[PDB]
Structure formats: structure tokens, C-alpha cells
Design a protein around this nucleic acid. Structure first.
Ligand code: K
Ligand code: MG
Ligand code: MG
Ligand code: MG
Ligand code: MG
Ligand code: MG
Ligand code: MG
Ligand code: MG
Length: 187
RNA sequence: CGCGGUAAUUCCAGCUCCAAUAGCGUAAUUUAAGUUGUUGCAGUUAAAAAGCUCGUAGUUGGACUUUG
């Protein structure tokens, strides 16, 4: 039944790491009374490790879009329970989204704006900094040719994200390929 | 543009000198003309903003969708 917590696209076989994440997810469903009720409906569809720095790993778990709103209500508590099981790792939930390529020249086919690459990358960035809310964005175009984005986070949720700023920057570059640094505006 | 009204560098002549030269002078059009201006002109007082507003055609129209 631990494989009923994973629905990989195309009914593909979960890898050796997804089963560990799924198996760890099943345990919290029954062991933790607080999360008993909520975790029943929730399920994931992928999971991967990303190296951050200093032999540190980050568990990036993708979630069905329809369930992206249910995880938020139990995001703060669930991450605490999964991080202890996955010692020395940070858990990040990102809803799955499709990126439809722009139509060719003179094509009648339409494309919803949410399926655009820019709209998806911005949406991934918002799901990456949960529970922190973005309050500003800056993009600096360096003379050499590279560009770096600076994201301002609400200082209210600073205790739950101050230690993850390195994981956010590393996780976002692999999913988007863009440099990002997070900062808290003075208040 | 001006010269000539009794001491004319300007007219009529001689001399001398100058330019082009087997050629040179005189009587539509291009250049000069950014004096027709697309490149590229003007409109306070020199020529030139309609007394004022609406308004169709015309002309002109913010940003955003695949990057790395
Ligand atoms: K010119
Ligand atoms: Mg005489
Ligand atoms: Mg003369
Ligand atoms: Mg004229
Ligand atoms: Mg003029
Ligand atoms: Mg007058
Ligand atoms: Mg006048
Ligand atoms: Mg436009």
C-alpha cells in the first residue's frame, strides 16, 4: 500500500529513492495522530535529491496540481516530520506543471498563459519559499553577461526559511537554470 | 552693386596687361537650393498656429507568452 502514495506519470516504476519517500510518507499517515486525517488523501508523483553544498542534500518532492492547495495547510508540520526521518536534508514541495512550447508562426492553436515558461518558473519560485511570501523581485544584469535575480521574502516567516536560503537557491537553479539569492527587507 | 555733372581705374580710343585658346562671347534646364527640406528647412517678434471645441476617413498607438 506504500506504493499507493506515489502516482508517477505514465504509470512508471518508482525508483529506489521514491519508494523510500513514499514509504516514509506512509509511516507518518498512521504513526502521527495529528497528521492521520490530512495525509489520507495526499499523494505524490516524484521525488529527487539535489546536492546543495558541503555534502548536503535536498529532497524535492513534486505534488499533483490538484493537491497543491491541500499540502499547504499541512506544509509546515509535514516538513518537520519528514526532515527528521530524512536527517540532514530539506524537504521542498512543488506542484507539477506543464510548459507548453509557444505555437509556430501562423498557428491558430492557442496556449493558456499558465502554461508559459515564464508563468511556470514564477509559480515554482512561489512554491519553493513556502511559507515565506515574496514581497519583491530584482534582476541584475551584470556587465559580463550573466544575470542574477534577488527575491525579497516577508520577514514574518524568517525563522522557517532563514536556514533554507541555500537550498532554495540550489533547488531553483536545477529546476529553472537561473541564479537567485534571497533576502529579507529591513522592517 | 554702380560709372559718367571738365583732373573718368568703369564710356570712346591707343598702349600695356589678364583669362581661356582653335576656340570664345550672347540669348530652356541641372547645380549652387538645407530658398520645397523623406534624408533635411520654417511658423513668440523676420512670411507663417485655424477664435474655440467636437468629430468620420487618414495617420499613429503601453506592457506581457521559450529562456537557460
Ligand atoms: K544631411
Ligand atoms: Mg582721361
Ligand atoms: Mg567692369
Ligand atoms: Mg526661393
Ligand atoms: Mg527659409
Ligand atoms: Mg509686423
Ligand atoms: Mg509675422
Ligand atoms: Mg506595442
Amino acid at each position: 500500500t506504500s506504493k499507493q502514495k506515489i502516482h508517477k506519470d505514465k504509470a512508471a516504476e518508482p525508483s529506489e529513492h521514491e519508494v523510500s519517500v513514499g514509504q516514509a510518507f506512509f509511516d507518518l499517515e498512521n504513526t502521527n495522530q495529528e497528521l492521520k486525517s490530512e495525509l489520507k488523501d495526499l499523494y505524490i508523483n516524484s521525488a529527487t535529491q539535489i546536492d546543495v553544498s558541503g555534502n548536503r542534500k535536498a529532497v524535492v518532492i513534486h505534488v499533483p496540481y490538484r493537491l497543491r492547495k491541500a499540502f499547504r495547510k499541512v506544509h509546515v508540520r509535514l516538513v518537520r516530520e519528514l526532515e527528521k526521518k530524512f536527517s540532514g536534508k530539506d524537504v521542498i514541495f512543488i506542484a507539477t506543471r506543464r510548459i507548453v512550447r509557444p505555437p509556430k508562426r501562423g498557428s491558430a492553436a492557442q496556449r493558456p498563459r499558465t502554461r508559459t515558461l515564464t508563468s511556470v518558473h514564477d509559480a515554482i519560485l512561489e512554491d519553493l519559499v513556502v511559507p515565506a511570501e515574496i514581497v519583491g523581485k530584482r534582476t541584475r544584469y551584470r556587465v559580463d553577461g550573466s544575470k542574477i535575480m534577488k527575491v525579497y521574502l516577508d520577514p514574518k516567516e524568517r525563522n522557517n526559511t532563514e536556514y533554507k536560503l541555500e537550498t532554495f537557491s540550489a533547488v531553483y537553479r536545477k529546476l529553472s537554470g537561473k541564479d537567485v539569492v534571497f533576502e529579507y527587507p529591513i522592517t
